[PDB]
Symmetry: C4
Subunit: 328 residues, 4 copies
């Protein structure tokens, strides 16, 4: 069954039938950083080869017009660049000059104006293109979207009781000794709806509260946590009986985001629960122990859940019954 | 008709008559990154040429004072830099030394003090200016203000009903497979007003609510969305009849902002609706379909709107009539 | 009269008598980027000179132990680095090898083990120190704290009436065609106070509201704005008569912050008003005009204020009188 | 006694028993930047040595297949790279070509195809790996987590009275002339609890208010501050008598975060108070003085606290007594 968000973040959406493609070329940098690696390497090689070959051709041209080929042996002919005979020899001079290697078996003389003004232009353009390419490679290597590989979520969430209130709970944890600076979490409910006038919204997004009003959703993440949402008169689950649950077709998306510590960039991680990942009347299992001055986690029970007792009735009915019996 | 914000972001404002221009030189870096390209290239070329020519002149001077010109042929005269005769030859030594090419047909000897202390200063200044220029070029290539080329807004917004409440709606969508991290939206109303005391504010900015109180304006953008603002007793549209609308002269600005994914920089996108982009009694057209495991968008109907039935009366009159008839 | 914040941001506070100075060396990078320029250049020169001289000494040592000095003329003695006789000659080899120039009049041979393993170490350390220094220079050139040079505030603020409510107003404006992304503003009141128990707080900081509750302080800055604070029952000015004002000794600080557009860094700007910058019964002067399709600003009247009529009574007395007379 | 957070930030938690280690290799960059220095240097050396040795071997191979070894003396044999006899000589050519030094005693000729296509590949791969390594080193040198070395907290917090209200107070200060841009503070209470149904949460995190509702926790940090939390009907200390305090086992964590000024990265600082750092009936000591136009701080009394008079009764009892006596 389709789910519109996979269990690891990838979305099932296919952007098709766009008529304005020239936008993809107005911001070419983003497009470059977005491709795969097999294509980035190919583009680097092509750009460098073209840049070298162009200046090789112009060097050979300057040599040819002046008349250096006709005098390849005359000593009384101080030429332009020394030891430059054919095409393949003039091709090597460009490589040795632009990449700054400069062996020195073929070197430039000082009786050849417009040679210096070609050399300046070559150095400047070399520097520019070099900067562009190395910057692209570095940015593609050090992006933050990778940290989300070690921010484990949990499988199926649970619904249970907490001192007279129904709640919906799930669990989240990290895996490295580093820190996520300024972490925060939110959750959305996705389900189709139809207004009373006739409109039909395919995928309506509603927001559910996990502590936005009291500032309790800026969490401090060291040990595995348990996020919980209370079912009051504003929660979309305000009346969902136990037997009523498996019939509905809804989905919960969960988003956690914060800054990486070493650099200062922002990362985001996502997940989803559909209808078969919501168990009624369960609890998680503790994972913390104390040993000689260190708390010890066990990511062995991180997904494990056990069963307990819980009423089977909607929150609305529970509240109505409690208020009727506490005043009768 | 002037509009104070064009349909793509550019503003119609002309900063004139400034008497303190030296500020533009206290933060020269911003000014450099702000210019066009035709001028950036010219400035790069000029800076590099001056830097090379200065040290060329000082090299020739050192050579001249010591007395190397008078002895261009004497073998018993170990000079300073070898094979350095005229101005144009001493100009090439600076280029080959600063850019680190170093052919080696003209090389420095070891009987010439103050040559080494010139060489150190040259290397250090070369490194500094090189860093400055390449940094400027890279920053100008990789700025985030470009991503806003693929964050399409919609043309004319609409006003219609939603289960007994008037609302004002518009639509927003993306075009790439990437993600905007931590997106958010806001909107402002611009219209001239005059207080009861006599003051006259030319362009008064008021804020309209799109979900700031319930944290519902931190949106999760994958598929094209429909942002809506409800017209309650606090909205500036609290009494605007249908026939009354075309007479007013107001404007709505819309701002969306968030972080690019690959890098970690912030981008912003804007738009506007004046008075002829607000239709009364219309709806948008759905664009989502389901195909074998993928949802399919069609940016073919993205701007398309159709017509439906809607009362023609201000929100205040609707509420008054409903409350009078639901209690009579 | 001291003011604890100057009219351009600098603060009058002198951190003295610190006993733990080794902290300033645990984060040496911040300390480097914080110094002046006259000292940064000196440190660059010193570091580079020491790095070159050390390896020069070790090269000469390797040459000496092996016995190359005793045979400066023997042809049947393939030595280590060719044409290396004295100290000053071995000093140049280090410069030419580390900075990658490599003339080639003194070149390394292939009969000299531990020469290659010295060359590797030299290349690696050169690369590291080069990276460190160029990074420091670039960061010091491109910091954002400079943009605040073109974010003009206004001189003396004013107090006047707005449709039956006292308000306190000041003005803020920009000077460039760029944009501040995600701007925001806040203000604090600084004044000494003494509790009823006996404590004495020298500089107590209180916050004043400029629109935090309604999200109206996220401003959209193109044309010069007028920020205003309303004097209700919670404002520290809840009873300040006209004649009572010049006797008090308080201060208002104003802070505006947001992101630069080209890069993605955050900048902050500050100012202050003491007791003689608060005029009672004045208004600002408009600066906007319309010309053929462009709005025109005039930073000629940006500071100009004129005079008008206003009651001379505290807000508390105004409210009490109005409520007594509107019910008598 | 264990405390779950040390007095300087380090946490007592030991992540053990992970079964999915391949994640640590999907984002190798983070792992590199996370190691110590002794290992980073070793990895740099190993990578560079392998990269040079590989291409050295392939150069020697090309030379061998063509038949250059058999003719080490024949003049009528224009070879590939000149003066290339053995393994150790072909090893030096790779070093001189990749690092761009290029002495020129062994130089490449122009009768040797597939030499140029090896040279292109070498230059490109050299550039890539160079970029990667220098980027890693720079990022590890300039991270912001170091600034937190000069953001001193205070030792034991205090509990006292403030015009008829109990409050809990602590102090925070800086040490440099720079500025933290957009500072903010929060605090959490950590204590084990057990619900009424039977669940047992080992380390339950609750939030305590320090000014989140009124926007008073965005502080402006120049001089040492005193943060205070008021004990109303929602504070977890709503009934804690003086004699009752030493029996409980709770902990308070404190977190302060904001952006560094020179760069634009975010830093975080933490601390903790357990049960013996909470004194009942004390006050801090002022540190500000005025001298000829400068305020002078004295970080000599920064931790010093003195004693005063205070009732010994829970806040609930104080309120009940006051309300009963103010209405009897
Ligand atoms: C080391 O490069 C491997 C390369 C082959 O990689 P390949 O051609 O299969 O392309 C990569 C592959 O598709 C990954 O799955 C992508 O990561 P993700 O699955 O989309 O997350 C990655 O994109 P991102 O990693 O840049 O996002 C792609 O570049 O080697 C040649
Ligand atoms: C590749 O360079 C093109 C250059 C000519 O470009 P040109 O001289 O017309 O100057 C550019 C042109 O004005 C664009 O319109 C600007 O972008 P936008 O319209 O203001 O958005 C751009 O500024 P920004 O792109 O830096 O902002 C300007 O640099 O070639 C020579
Ligand atoms: C171009 O360099 C000038 C240099 C002399 O500058 P100088 O020695 O006087 O030192 C600078 C001077 O003190 C400025 O006033 C400072 O800026 P600000 O007044 O504190 O804002 C600046 O610090 P920042 O600009 O790095 O903050 C200092 O570096 O030339 C030699
Ligand atoms: C200059 O390098 C020193 C190096 C030895 O340092 P060493 O091998 O002991 O490793 C460092 C040491 O463990 C520090 O304590 C760490 O800082 P912190 O205590 O965890 O904060 C630091 O990590 P971070 O500083 O990268 O975080 C480690 O790199 O010299 C060789
Ligand atoms: K070089
Ligand atoms: K070189
Ligand atoms: K060279
Ligand atoms: K050379
Ligand atoms: K808020
Ligand atoms: K040579
Ligand atoms: K960089
Ligand atoms: K950043
Ligand atoms: Na962690
Ligand atoms: Na997208
Ligand atoms: Na502006
Ligand atoms: Na400070």
């Amino acid at each position: 069954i389709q789910r519109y968000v996979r269990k690891d973040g990838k979305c099932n959406v296919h952007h098709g039938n766009v008529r304005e493609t020239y936008r993809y070329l107005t911001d070419i940098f983003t497009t470059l950083v977005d491709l795969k690696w097999r294509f980035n390497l190919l583009i680097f090689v092509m750009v460098y080869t073209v840049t070298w070959l162009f200046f090789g051709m112009i060097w050979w041209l300057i040599a040819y017009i002046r008349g250096d080929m006709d005098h390849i042996e005359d000593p009384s002919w101080t030429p332009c660049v020394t030891n430059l005979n054919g095409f393949v020899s003039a091709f090597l001079f460009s490589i040795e000059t632009e990449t700054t290697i400069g062996y020195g078996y073929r070197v430039i003389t000082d009786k050849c104006p417009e040679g210096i003004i070609l050399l300046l232009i070559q150095s400047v353009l070399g520097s520019i293109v070099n900067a562009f390419m190395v910057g692209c490679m570095f940015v593609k290597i050090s992006q933050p979207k990778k940290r989300a590989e070690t921010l484990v979520f949990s499988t199926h969430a649970v619904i249970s009781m907490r001192d007279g209130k129904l709640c919906l709970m799930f669990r989240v944890g990290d895996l490295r000794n580093s820190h996520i600076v300024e972490a925060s979490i939110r959750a959305k409910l996705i389900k189709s709806k139809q207004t009373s006038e006739g409109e039909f919204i395919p995928l309506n997004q509603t927001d559910i509260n996990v502590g936005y009003y009291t500032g309790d959703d800026r969490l401090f993440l060291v040990s595995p946590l348990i996020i919980s949402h209370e079912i009051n008169q504003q929660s979309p689950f305000w009346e969902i009986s136990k037997a009523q649950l498996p019939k509905e077709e809804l989905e919960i998306v969960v988003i956690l985001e914060g800054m990486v510590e070493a650099t200062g960039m922002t990362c985001q991680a996502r997940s989803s629960y559909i209808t078969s990942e919501i168990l009624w009347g369960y609890r998680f299992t503790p994972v913390l122990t104390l040993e000689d001055g260190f708390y010890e986690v066990d990511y062995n029970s991180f997904h494990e859940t056990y069963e307990t007792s819980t009423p089977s009735l909607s929150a609305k009915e529970l509240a109505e019954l409690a208020n009727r019996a506490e005043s009768n």
